[PDB]
Symmetry: C2
Subunit: 160 residues, 2 copies
C-alpha cells in the first residue's frame, strides 16, 4: 500500500508527430502500470501502427507488427478494468486491444471517433490531449486491403 504514484501523462513520438495523452491510473491501475512500464523500458520503440482504419481508430503496440504478438509486463495476459465513468464516448480515447475478455497484452489503439460498441469490451485508460491532428494524420494514410499502411508509421518512443 505504500508505493509510488503511477505516471498520468505520456508523450508518444511518432513518424508523423507527437501525441500527448493523459491516463487514468486511479480507475485502471493495472492497465496504466503495464502501459507506462512498457513505455519507460522502450518496449514500444519502433512499433508499427500496423492496423489503421480511417473513421475508426489506429492500432499499435505489437512487437511483431501484425496483431499476433506482444505481452504484458507480467508475461501473462491480464484483466480488463472497466468503469462506467470511462467510455469510448468521444474521439481520441486510448484503449486496450484484445481477443476477448481478460486477454490484455501490450497492443493498444486510439480512436478517431466515438466507438460506443467497444464499451465494456476494451479497457479505456486514457485520452489524447494534444496532437489530435497527428492522430488524424496517421488515420488518413493509404493502406492495403488488410488496413496496413503502405509506408510504415512508427512509434519512435513514448516518454514518461
Amino acid at each position: 500500500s505504500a508505493t509510488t504514484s503511477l505516471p498520468e501523462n505520456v508523450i508518444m513520438h511518432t513518424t508523423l508527430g507527437d501525441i500527448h495523452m493523459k491516463l487514468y491510473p486511479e480507475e485502471c491501475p493495472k492497465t496504466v502500470e503495464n502501459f507506462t512500464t512498457h513505455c519507460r523500458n522502450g518496449y514500444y520503440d519502433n512499433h508499427l501502427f500496423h492496423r489503421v482504419i480511417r473513421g475508426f481508430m489506429i492500432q499499435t503496440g505489437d512487437p511483431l507488427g501484425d496483431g499476433t504478438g506482444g505481452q504484458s509486463i507480467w508475461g501473462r495476459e491480464f484483466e480488463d478494468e472497466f468503469h462506467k465513468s470511462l467510455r469510448h464516448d468521444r474521439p481520441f480515447t486510448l484503449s486496450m486491444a484484445n481477443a476477448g475478455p481478460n486477454t490484455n497484452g501490450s497492443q493498444f489503439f486510439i480512436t478517431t471517433v466515438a466507438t460506443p460498441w467497444l464499451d465494456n469490451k476494451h479497457t479505456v485508460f486514457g485520452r489524447v490531449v494534444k496532437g489530435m491532428d497527428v492522430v488524424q494524420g496517421i488515420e488518413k494514410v493509404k493502406t492495403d486491403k488488410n488496413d496496413r499502411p503502405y509506408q510504415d508509421v512508427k512509434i519512435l518512443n513514448v516518454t514518461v
Copy 2:
C-alpha cells in the same frame, strides 16, 4: 553523376520535443550524406546530448555518450566542407564537432547563439527552422562540472 537527391530536411525527436532542421547538401554533400544516412539507419537513436553549455551550444551524436566515440558512414573520419556562405552567424546553426581539421565522424552540435570563432573550423551544414524553443529548453538543463546533464536528454529518432 546520375544519383539520388540528398534529403534537405529532418525532424529530430528528443526527450524535450522536436527540432526541425534544414540542411545544405549542395554546399556540404559529404556531411549531409553522412548525417542523413546515419539518421535513416537509426544510428543516432537514443544518443545523449552529452555536452550542454548554456549560452553556447548542445552537442550529441556519440554512441558512447561522452565525446570519445562515433564514426562516419565510411568507417573513417572525413573532410571538412567549409564555405564562405555558411557561417556560425546566427543562433541555432547545425555543425560537426571534431578534433581538428578533417576529423569528422558522427558527433554534431547546435548553437544557441552566433559562434563566429568556429567559422572555418567546423562544417556548418544546416540550421534549425522549427523547435528553436526546444533547443533552448535543452540548453538550460542542470549540468555537472563537465557540462553533462544530470537528467539524460536523448535523441529518440531523426526522421528523413
